[PDB]
Amino acid sequence: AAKIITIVPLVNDLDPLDILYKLLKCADDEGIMVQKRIFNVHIKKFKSNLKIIIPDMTNFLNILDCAKVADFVVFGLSGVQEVDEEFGEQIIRALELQGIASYIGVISNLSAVHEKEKFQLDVKQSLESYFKHFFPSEERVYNLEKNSDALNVLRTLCQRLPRSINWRDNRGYVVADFVDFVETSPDSGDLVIEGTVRGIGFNANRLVHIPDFGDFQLNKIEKEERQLREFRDMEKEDREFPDEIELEPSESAIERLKRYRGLKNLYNCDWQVDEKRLLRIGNYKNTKNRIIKETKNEAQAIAGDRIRMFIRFPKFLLEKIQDPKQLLFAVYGLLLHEHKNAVVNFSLQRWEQYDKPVPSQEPIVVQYGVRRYTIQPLFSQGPNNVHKYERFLHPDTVSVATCIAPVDFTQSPAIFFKPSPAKNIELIGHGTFLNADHSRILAKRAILTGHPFRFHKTVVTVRYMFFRPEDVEWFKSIPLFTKSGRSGFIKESLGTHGYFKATFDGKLSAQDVVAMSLYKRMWPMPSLPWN
């Protein structure tokens, strides 16, 4: 069974094939050297097989995807060019946040630094400290031009036990060496795949996932600036006045507040899980552990088995499949029921240095594990089982983004992004799949404020909350409060423009602000896959 190595140059001045040559050369075997993008090589020197993947370096997602399947990631650093904040640095961060196995840093490049040798070494040392910043396990950064440093790296790749990646190792996966098709019906056929099994294995009675194609059945197994400023302005509004609603004299409160219900305090909410065909799960923690135990047991092809895998595959997709020795063709097992949609909950924290606002309900993409979906999330905070909906992702804390997507039964890392011609993509967030839990109720608050201005001992009279008597009358029965902590109730309508009379606990002043609080139940939205 081969160790999967992928080479990731963190600077565009580095040629990935140069790193490969230097690594291969320090095995005295000119029968390796003469030998488009994914290579199987024997190392008769450490008696080891390596499968070396060079991603398409001009596609961020392809990079991420080669790194997923990797046992070792070899990072190329540059002696003369700085790592780019917007590209290579982001590769480092995306690589860790999605889950990375083992990793080693190299320079293929030192001689390009045309300065005294104390200087060159101190550039290496500075690369070692930039690297240690992200990968503390990694003291040294290996000079691939010094033979004995090249040999070190090679020996490690061949012999050292790889680190593990939870989400991908608790499902099965395979990197395809050969891919061929076979007709069986007019509309479809068998996509035949050859590779070594990794992970927990495969069972023919299960589904299989190919990015970016979808889920498939197994037959058998053989051995721009405009939108920004508007969202920015709404973010500022919601920020200064949450969750205020300002009625105008012209409009109807009955019609504006149409889906809202009376509710002061959020711990007193007694909404059921009623109606606005999804999977619902008793306890997520337990069934997760049942499913993984189950699939491990029922597996028929086990890590290290050479496999011929027949996948029920439609013909119109054949056009999109490209050479498995040039781009990566990988196949991930799905666990029981990961095909089925459910009310799902991720966690989410802004990316480093991400300024732009990220509002609820807006098209965003998640990668979680290997899957990628366009979701429309509802944000809220970390109680009594109901949570305050927040219209915008808060500034500097972790939130819960809930929606309807297919369940994940590892607890895959999550990375959130939009497309944006940067590196054709815009990285906005990161977190992990927490949950299927349709008991999480999302409630959106609305605050109406009014000004008390006449005081007859017991009775205050208030204006500019409502602007029509018939609005005052519709909402008569919702409790009032003041930000100073008093509690109240509307007595009667007063006049014709929404003045009302209200009685309260204590005495109020004309500095006091009286308010009314309403909540609207917020329903998780559906999502669809992304390619």
Author numbering: 82 to 116, 121 to 308, 465 to 517, 527 to 632, 636 to 674, 677 to 786
Report text from the authors:
The 5' region of pre-rRNA that consists of the 5' external transcribed spacer (5' ETS), 18S rRNA and the internal transcribed spacer 1 (ITS1) is co-transcriptionally packed into a terminal ball of ~40 nm in size. These particles represent the earliest assembly intermediates of 40S and are known as the 90S pre-ribosome or the SSU processome. Within 90S, the pre-rRNA is cleaved at sites A0 and A1 in the 5' ETS and site A2 in the ITS1, yielding a 20S pre-rRNA intermediate. The fully assembled 90S contains an unprocessed pre-18S rRNA, U3 snoRNA, approximately 51 assembly factors and 18 r-proteins with a molecular mass of 5.0 megadaltons.
Bms1 is a GTPase and associates with Rcl1.
